[PDB]
Amino acid sequence: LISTAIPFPYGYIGGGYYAPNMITFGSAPKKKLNSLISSTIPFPYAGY
Amino acid sequence: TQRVLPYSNGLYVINKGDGYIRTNDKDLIGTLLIEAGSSGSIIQPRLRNTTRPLFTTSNDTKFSQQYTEERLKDAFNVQLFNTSTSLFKFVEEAPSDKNICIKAYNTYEKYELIDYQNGSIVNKAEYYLPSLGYCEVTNAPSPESEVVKMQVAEDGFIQNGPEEEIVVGVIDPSENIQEINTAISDNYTYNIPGIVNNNPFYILFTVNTTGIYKINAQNNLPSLKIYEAIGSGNRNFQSGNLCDDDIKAINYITGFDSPNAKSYLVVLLNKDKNYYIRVPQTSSNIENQIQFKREEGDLRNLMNSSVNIIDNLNSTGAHYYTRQSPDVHDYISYEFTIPGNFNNKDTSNIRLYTSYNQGIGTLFRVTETIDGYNLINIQQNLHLLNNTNSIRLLNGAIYILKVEVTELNNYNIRLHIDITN
Amino acid sequence: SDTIDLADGNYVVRRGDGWILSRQNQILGGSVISNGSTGIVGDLRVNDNAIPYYYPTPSFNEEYIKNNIQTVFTNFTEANQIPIGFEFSKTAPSNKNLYMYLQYTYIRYEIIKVLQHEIIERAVLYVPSLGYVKSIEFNPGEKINKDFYFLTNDKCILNEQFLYKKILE
Amino acid sequence: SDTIDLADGNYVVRRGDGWILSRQNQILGGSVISNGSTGIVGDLRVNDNAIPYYYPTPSFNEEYIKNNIQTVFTNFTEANQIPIGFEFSKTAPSNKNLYMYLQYTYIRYEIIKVLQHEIIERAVLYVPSLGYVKSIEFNPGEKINKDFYFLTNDKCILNEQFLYKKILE
Amino acid sequence: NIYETEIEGNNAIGNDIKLRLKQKFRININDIWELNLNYFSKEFSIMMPD
Ligand SMILES: [Mg+2]
Ligand SMILES: [Mg+2]
Numbered sequence: 001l002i003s004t005a006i007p008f009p010y011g012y013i014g015g016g017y018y019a020p021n022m023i024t025f026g027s028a029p030k031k032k033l034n035s036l037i038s039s040t041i042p043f044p045y046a047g048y
Numbered sequence: 049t050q051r052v053l054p055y056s057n058g059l060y061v062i063n064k065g066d067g068y069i070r071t072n073d074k075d076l077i078g079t080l081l082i083e084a085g086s087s088g089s090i091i092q093p094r095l096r097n098t099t100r101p102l103f104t105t106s107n108d109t110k111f112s113q114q115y116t117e118e119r120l121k122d123a124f125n126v127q128l129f130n131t132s133t134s135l136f137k138f139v140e141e142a143p144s145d146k147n148i149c150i151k152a153y154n155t156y157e158k159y160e161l162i163d164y165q166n167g168s169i170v171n172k173a174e175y176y177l178p179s180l181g182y183c184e185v186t187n188a189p190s191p192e193s194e195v196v197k198m199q200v201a202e203d204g205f206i207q208n209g210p211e212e213e214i215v216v217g218v219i220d221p222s223e224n225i226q227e228i229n230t231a232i233s234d235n236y237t238y239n240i241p242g243i244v245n246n247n248p249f250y251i252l253f254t255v256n257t258t259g260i261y262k263i264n265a266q267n268n269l270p271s272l273k274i275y276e277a278i279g280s281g282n283r284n285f286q287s288g289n290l291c292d293d294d295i296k297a298i299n300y301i302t303g304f305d306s307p308n309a310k311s312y313l314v315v316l317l318n319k320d321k322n323y324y325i326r327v328p329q330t331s332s333n334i335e336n337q338i339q340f341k342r343e344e345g346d347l348r349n350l351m352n353s354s355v356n357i358i359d360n361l362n363s364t365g366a367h368y369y370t371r372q373s374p375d376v377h378d379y380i381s382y383e384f385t386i387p388g389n390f391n392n393k394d395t396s397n398i399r400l401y402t403s404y405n406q407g408i409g410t411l412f413r414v415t416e417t418i419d420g421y422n423l424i425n426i427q428q429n430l431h432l433l434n435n436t437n438s439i440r441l442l443n444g445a446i447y448i449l450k451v452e453v454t455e456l457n458n459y460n461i462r463l464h465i466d467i468t469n
Numbered sequence: 470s471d472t473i474d475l476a477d478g479n480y481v482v483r484r485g486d487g488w489i490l491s492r493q494n495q496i497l498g499g500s501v502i503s504n505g506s507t508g509i510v511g512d513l514r515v516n517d518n519a520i521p522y523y524y525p526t527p528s529f530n531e532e533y534i535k536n537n538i539q540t541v542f543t544n545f546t547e548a549n550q551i552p553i554g555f556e557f558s559k560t561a562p563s564n565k566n567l568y569m570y571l572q573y574t575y576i577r578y579e580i581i582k583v584l585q586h587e588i589i590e591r592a593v594l595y596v597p598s599l600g601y602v603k604s605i606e607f608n609p610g611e612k613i614n615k616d617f618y619f620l621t622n623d624k625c626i627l628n629e630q631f632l633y634k635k636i637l638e
Numbered sequence: 639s640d641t642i643d644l645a646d647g648n649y650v651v652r653r654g655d656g657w658i659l660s661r662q663n664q665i666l667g668g669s670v671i672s673n674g675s676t677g678i679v680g681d682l683r684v685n686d687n688a689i690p691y692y693y694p695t696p697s698f699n700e701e702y703i704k705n706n707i708q709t710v711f712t713n714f715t716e717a718n719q720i721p722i723g724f725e726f727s728k729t730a731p732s733n734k735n736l737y738m739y740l741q742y743t744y745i746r747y748e749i750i751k752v753l754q755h756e757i758i759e760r761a762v763l764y765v766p767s768l769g770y771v772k773s774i775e776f777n778p779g780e781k782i783n784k785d786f787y788f789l790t791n792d793k794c795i796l797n798e799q800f801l802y803k804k805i806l807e
Numbered sequence: 808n809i810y811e812t813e814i815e816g817n818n819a820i821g822n823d824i825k826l827r828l829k830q831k832f833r834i835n836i837n838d839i840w841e842l843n844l845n846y847f848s849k850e851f852s853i854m855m856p857d
Contacts, residue, residue: 042819078599087558180667210776279660283762
């Protein structure tokens with residue numbers, strides 16, 4: 001219980017516990033111009 | 049003129065397709081107007097687990113949400129109902145000539161839990177599991193066109209995905225399951241415990257050597273049904289023992305729902321698979337046993353089917369027997385004795401046919417030898433649907449008719465044995 | 470005009486998607502790209518930027534509008550708690566400058582009281598849906614039309630709808 | 639499978655990557671795209687979706703399997719805390735609808751017991767590696783093959799492996 | 808409530824934080840208040856001033 005009773009962490013820097021901000025990464029070169037074809041990740045992912 | 053559903057009595061889970069959306073834009077994520085040469089993406093980043101499933105039912109007390117979720121988990125092993133982490137993203141690039149609009153919809157996958165009992169559905173529930181969206185692109189409408197006033201549509205669902213209907217039977221959770229902890233090699237007698245106390249239940253077992261087996265309760269009473277655990281024996285395996293995978297998804301092999309049935313099962317069993325045996329509510333306190341026998345002789349010619357033992361064939365005239373019809377390319381067998389004293393010489397003119405379902409029949413002359421039964425193929429390619437042809441058979445002799453259903457036109461098959469002379 | 474071919478009573482109306490509000494065009498900023506570069510802009514609709522805007526009337530207060538709209542149409546109070554992201558991508562031609570600015574789009578809902586085939590009272594709800602960008606090719610010092618930057622009255626970039634259902638007493 | 643050419647004892651076996659489980663195909667969900675759009679479906683292997691599935695035997699409990707596999711093969715307890723993403727993108731043809739569904743792939747590990755060159759006991763661990771999607775272009779009302787949707791038994795979409803190491807006492 | 812409504816439905820957190828919070832809130836406050844040394848004196852059979 002002591003090992004699992006971590007103190008409550010503070011939320012994101014801007015204030016809040018709800019959700020990250022997301023960000024886009026990657027591209028497929030081309031005919032098509034795959035510029036919006038990419039990966040999406042939560043931006044902080046650990047902001048607490 | 050509905051289609052006939054040849055399902056045995058039990059609980060079934062039906063995946064009825066993907067891409068279902070509610071009417072009146074209830075599942076509309078949004079619309080992007082992409083200019084000429086531009087690109088537009090709508091993203092589900094799954095920053096929150098929350099997904100919202102839908103559920104309607106005909107009977108709440110038995111087919112509740114918890115019950116339906118547990119049955120879905122039994123059939124397709126789904127375990128995320130209120131959450132999901134799966135990302136989806138719709139990207140569309142408008143051509144250089146005109147603009148484009150993209151609409152994104154949250155989709156659902158339609159599962160239907162049914163209680164099928166003797167040819168009709170007595171309880172039906174619909175569970176809509178949140179799917180991964182639907183994207184439609186349209187030409188950018190001319191801004192005026194005409195704004196036409198329209199009434200809303202009724203609450204319902206529209207499937208934009210491909211046609212799908214996958215049926216999986218599920219173990220009834222209210223019926224007990226006994227375990228044969230040891231594999232069955234060649235012969236086995238399983239004494240029905242007094243614990244279950246003449247209530248319908250399942251017997252989970254495995255086989256030592258792959259082959260055909262004859263399974264029957266005593267005096268062939270009551271009738272049994274045999275299921276195969278779908279996907280069993282894939283992962284964990286102990287040779288000569290049972291590895292209970294807790295697989296509730298079952299595949300109906302054969303068996304009659306009527307417990308007042310004289311019938312015995314001939315079924316091909318694999319050593320690397322788990323099998324359930326559902327035996328129904330018996331009305332008697334008398335001790336009953338399940339007999340497994342590895343068939344090496346001519347009972348192997350009867351796979352896979354439940355063979356009907358016919359006893360009321362004692363007079364000359366019209367006799368018809370109504371049983372639950374097996375599916376197309378499935379088998380049902382009838383073991384019957386021609387009335388009269390057997391003196392090798394007396395013969396009676398037999399006419400065999402069916403009422404509504406067409407099938408190919410094969411007749412075997414059964415002579416009980418010292419090594420078991422012996423079947424002599426004496427009649428093949430028997431088109432039984434309204435068959436007018438007749439064959440003379442010896443009085444007092446035993447015969448077995450195997451019927452393979454070719455056309456499925458009625459939930460029941462009526463085998464007519466008309467006897468003259 | 471304000472005359473409609475409906476029987477007397479109260480009605481819930483969905484006017485469609487793609488509604489941008491007045492004076493709220495450049496509230497989010499814009500990008501300046503040039504000479505073959507590709508500019509991409511994106512946003513995430515969560516909570517404080519997903520605030521719905523109510524414009525009630527004496528008969529139709531906030532609770533009335535919210536309950537009716539969510540009963541008949543998309544349930545926005547729970548939908549706006551789920552983050553939805555979106556992106557746009559423009560490519561400027563060679564040796565030219567392009568400016569693109571992004572603004573929020575909204576769903577327009579209306580609660581209308583109809584008497585004698587004429588609307589005598591109407592309340593308006595805006596539910597945040599997504600965004601929309603406008604782009605222009607420009608040169609240094611070139612005068613730009615006031616219409617590109619500033620929107621005087623709320624309009625729909627898409628086809629306006631009228632999806633109505635009578636409110637039951 | 640039976641009677642291998644191995645000495646008696648216990649073995650840890652790697653069966654390769656790309657194992658999809660039975661009846662688990664469409665439990666993750668599907669996407670329907672149409673008319674020139676591009677659909678991207680993907681996931682992030684973190685936390686609960688990275689938890690492996692165990693199938694033990696009387697001789698090989700959970701701890702035996704985990705410790706032996708991690709001693710020989712990739713340590714999946716440490717590696718599943720680091721998020722790893724994957725995605726699949728498919729483009730719909732013009733004037734047609736395409737369906738795509740996703741299912742996880744698993745690394746299949748086995749703990750086997752060989753007695754007189756014949757496998758008498760086998761326990762199986764599935765470690766969630768990555769995903770795999772299947773797509774088909776469909777017409778309204780068209781019948782779809784039962785193999786595209788449903789899977790009867792656990793199978794490997796790639797070439798199966800058999801990498802064995804004898805577990806020492 | 809902060810955990811149950813916000814931290815739980817947030818898959819941009821490692822399990823090392825939210826699982827520990829899950830186990831932390833499995834306990835009630837009255838459990839902490841009722842916890843004392845007599846319980847461990849009985850469990851360990853340890854003599855102490857009373
Ligand atoms: Mg009967
Ligand atoms: Mg390592």
